[PDB]
């Protein structure tokens, strides 16, 4: 594996390098919205922003080094962590809004709808990473450990273990990245160790934010006013709700 | 299965 | 307004917290090795109301919760009650793989599970948590830190400082345990990361097991106390 | 009126 043979400098430009390009909605100020068609641009916009996310994490040092079937495991699982974080990510220098996309940008008001709750969460870990003031290089290394994290746990036998314990050691690469960053930003070996927790401990927050996600994805989808794509439905689907 | 295929490809 | 939290000292801090530990608590006496969704749910929901009690008194003695407003105090304590009670689980099976030990005289496997639609998937990931911390050889200082570390995180960013700084002498308290315990440097990072993770995984499962309590709840076959209904009733 | 209201009290 290469992955484990990265520095801490090539690992965060190889993560940098495979960050993926922030998509447009086809939202227009000028046409009026429902609450409806309003998700139904929010939904269309996470299922183009799925197929970059698929071929970002074919560039995660690692990730390729697992079985098909374990690499479909690991975005099953952690998707909608991921695009909320990135979400999160984007919104964190507009203080109460979220930047869903560069011509939609929204306050809780328009969230309209359960989703209520959703939004406020969203705006609540965007302030927490200003607060802390999160770097890029350290974003890129807490999307990646959301990817390699997120389902390591829920996957037959004795060498089906080997793959994770490659999954492992990659996180601890990932760790070591983090560490060397903030040391390079001036950072005691205490406050190391406290803004490494302080970051991880967001990651918990992101898992909980997920999970009523894909709740309200599925309640969505039994109504069926707004349109879902397939490969959103398919995503759905194995989070078995 | 979409997910599948998108990352064989 | 100062916290007493801060100013103790990490061998303090440890100390403090084993001391607040809650006694393990035993299930009916009854032989029968419950078989039905009725007996199995019914034993664990008993167990799980008596533990809160416990929990509650416990939290009371963790260093900074009770300088927390008696709504901040509730809200954290709503938001982790499930994933406290996880974690505990977990510990206390940790030597005892592949098995759960609700109570000394509650020791269930998956295929128990089985028995409540529903109750396999959570058993699974309880079970591999159970396993993760033993090959990890977690050490009851440490899991006393990560359990009061739920109670101060899980809630806090729906709500501050007092929090943070609270959680941030914690952190410290991991860091001097495993530096105590002969670990290097990259060790001790690394170890930190892996145990923080895993806090994830525990968050998981908490929803994955909320939703089971209340789908339980809409059934109306097993009675739930209405301290339980309360705690449930707040994840809305 | 919460019944953990009355518990972190008592
Ligand atoms: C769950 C869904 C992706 C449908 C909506 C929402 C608001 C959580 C979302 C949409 C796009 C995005 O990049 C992040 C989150
Ligand atoms: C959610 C409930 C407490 C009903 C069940 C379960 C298996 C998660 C549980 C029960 C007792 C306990 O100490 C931990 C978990």
Not at chain 1, 39 to 59: C, F, S
């Amino acid at each position: 594996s290469l992955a484990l043979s990265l520095t801490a400098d090539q690992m965060v430009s190889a993560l940098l390098d495979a960050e993926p390009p922030i998509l447009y909605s086809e939202y227009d100020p000028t046409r009026p919205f429902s609450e409806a068609s309003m998700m139904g641009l929010l939904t269309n916009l996470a299922d183009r922003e799925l197929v970059h996310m698929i071929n970002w994490a074919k560039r995660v040092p690692g990730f390729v080094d697992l079985t098909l079937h374990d690499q479909v495991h690991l975005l099953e699982c952690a998707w909608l962590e991921i695009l909320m974080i990135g979400l999160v990510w984007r919104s964190m220098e507009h203080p109460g809004k979220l930047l869903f996309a560069p011509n939609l940008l929204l306050d809780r008001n328009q969230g309209k709808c359960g989703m209520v709750e959703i939004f406020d969460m969203l705006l609540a870990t965007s302030s927490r990473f200003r607060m802390m003031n999160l770097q890029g290089e350290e974003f890129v290394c807490l999307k990646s450990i959301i990817l390699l994290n997120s389902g390591v746990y829920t996957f037959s036998t004795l060498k089906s273990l080997e793959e994770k314990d490659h999954i492992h050691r990659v996180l601890d690469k990932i760790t070591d990245t983090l560490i060397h960053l903030m040391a390079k930003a001036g950072l005691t070996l205490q406050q190391q160790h406290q803004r490494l927790a302080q970051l991880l401990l967001i990651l918990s927050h992101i898992r909980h934010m997920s999970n009523k996600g894909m709740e309200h994805l599925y309640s969505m989808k039994c109504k069926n006013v707004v349109p879902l794509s397939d490969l959103l439905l398919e995503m759905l689907d194995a989070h078995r709700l | 299965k979409i997910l599948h295929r998108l990352l064989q490809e």
